[PDB]
Structures are given as structure tokens and as C-alpha cells.
């Protein structure tokens, strides 16, 4: 079969997300971009009363943090403009993810994401050198050119060094949601290349349910689908029975979100993408209004299982 991926997002592709993606049936989860000037402050630390991997900054900041249950499926994304920075960065998390991933699409310090487009020189250096320093699979995400021939020429160019995949978000540096993504440019690429395109920008005018993601492979010929937007709305569009009621989802995503201690801001702020239109139900407002991660669960009705968890959490610590 052809893999189901969740696309890297910042702030959403924390672990609990990650886990729950997974049980709905995403064969690969991509964490958030990751940029490599912090990452290169972090030391590895196994945390026990968690069962977690975390990665944490001199400030005692756990910027990464994994558990075994997402080891073979994790793919790692940095934000790096310098290719020692970014082996620096790989060689550090490398045991602990089945994959490094390199942000080539961000139009959001400088030098990083879609910027790196212009540079086809510094692509080439910074791919090239995590291919041959890692043993792990390498891949790199990116956005469209305004020329197709210029598009074409840099993807052959990436292909040269040796990643495992590329991830084409099939919209231009400038272009924002509203403008349709370029199926016939991610064609375009996936006939091109000989290693396998992961087809990505289809969420909402394309993706809205479980079958609209191999139609969208097809329409574009990849190897396999990436899917950020619609994952965020309703992480169990990666099932394939249909959506789960959002109740449902929520439930799940919190109890996560406590059994690996998740920053309250962080579940707030995922939660919320999910509700959209909902935020303005007294269930929406009281999660609003949340100021702690009990708060959270006490607007869901998890405020017994949030005790019991945080408790035996704290009798192991
Ligand atoms: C909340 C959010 C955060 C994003 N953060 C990142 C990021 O960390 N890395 C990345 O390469 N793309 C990032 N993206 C872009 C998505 O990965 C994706 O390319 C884009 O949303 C198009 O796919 P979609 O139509 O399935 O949403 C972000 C998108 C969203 C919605
Ligand atoms: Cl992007
Ligand atoms: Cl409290």
C-alpha cells in the first residue's frame, strides 16, 4: 500500500498529536520544524517517569521529546541554513527518530525554509553532507518555483545527493491557501524523479475525507500523500472507516497530552484548531479560559483522569 504522512507543523506536531495521528492510521509522522541553533544547545536525556526521549535546552526546555512507540515512524524536521550545523543536529537525534527531514519550503533568523530555494548550491551542500554523515533516511521538504523548467532542474539537482524522498508542497514561495495547489507540477516531478515524491498541499480543496487522499495521489502520480491542515482539523482523516467525531478525537489528543506532559499552551492551541467554529460553545470558552492542563481536562470532563495520571506520575518522581 501507499504511506499516509503527517506533514510537519509547528506547534501542532508535538507528541501527543504525533501518537494519536499514528493510532488513526498515518504510516509516518513528521514533527514540527525544529530549528538547528537550538537544537545544537540540547542535550539527550531518558526520562524515566515519562518513558520519553526528551531533548532539552540549557534553559531546562524540552524541545524534543519521543517515546518508543513513535522510534520506526518519527521523521525529525530541522530549520537549518548551514550544513555542519544541520549534521550536528542529525548526529544528535539520529538513534532516536527513524528519519531526518530538511525545511526547504518555509516562506515564514533567515536563511532557512523556502529562502533556501534561491541557493541551490547551499541545498546541495547541506543534503549531500546528512546523506553521507547518517545512516538514516534523509529527506527534504519543498515549495514550487515560478518556472517550471527552474523547478525541474533543482529537483533533478536534490535528487544527485542522494536523499531517500522529497515532499513537494505545490504552491510557489508567495502563494497562500487560497491559491490551488499544482497537481500537474507534482506530476511533473513524480515523472521526472526515480525516487518516490510525497505529494502534498491538497487539504480542504482536495483532502476532506479519508478517500480524497489517493485521489490526490493519483491526480498527481507521488509515491504517497503528506497531509498538514486537514490532520490538524480532524487527525482521524489518516482512517480509513471515516471521521471520528471530534468529541472523540479530543478525548484521545488530552489524555495523551497528560500521560507525556505536554506544555497546557501547546494542548490549548492544538485544541483549538480542531474546535474552530465550535470555540464559541461553553465547552470552547471554558478551554478559553484554561490556565493549567487540569483546567483543560475539568472543560472536558477528564479532571479524575488527569489525578490519577499526574499522581502515579508524581509518586515515580
Ligand atoms: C499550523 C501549520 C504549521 C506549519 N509548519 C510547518 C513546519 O513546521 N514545517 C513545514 O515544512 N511546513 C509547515 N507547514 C506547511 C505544511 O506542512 C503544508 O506544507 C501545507 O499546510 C500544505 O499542506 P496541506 O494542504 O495538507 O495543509 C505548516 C502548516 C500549518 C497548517
Ligand atoms: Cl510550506
Ligand atoms: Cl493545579
Known sequence: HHHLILAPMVRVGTLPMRLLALDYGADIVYCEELIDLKMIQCKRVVNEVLSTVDFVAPDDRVVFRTCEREQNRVVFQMGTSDAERALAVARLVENDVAGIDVNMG????????????????????????????????????????????????????????????????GRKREERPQHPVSCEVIKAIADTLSIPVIANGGSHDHIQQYSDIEDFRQATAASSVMVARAAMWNPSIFLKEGLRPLEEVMQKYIRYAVQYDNHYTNTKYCLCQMLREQLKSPQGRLLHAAQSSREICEAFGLGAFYEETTQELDAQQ
Open 106 to 169: 518555509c516562506p515564514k533568523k533567515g536563511g532557512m525554509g523556502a529562502a533556501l530555494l534561491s541557493d541551490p548550491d547551499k541545498i546541495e551542500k547541506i543534503l549531500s553532507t546528512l546523506v553521507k554523515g547518517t545512516r538514516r533516511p534523509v529527506t527534504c521538504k519543498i515549495r514550487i518555483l515560478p518556472s517550471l523548467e527552474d523547478t525541474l532542474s533543482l529537483v533533478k539537482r536534490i535528487e544527485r545527493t542522494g536523499i531517500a524522498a522529497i515532499a513537494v508542497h
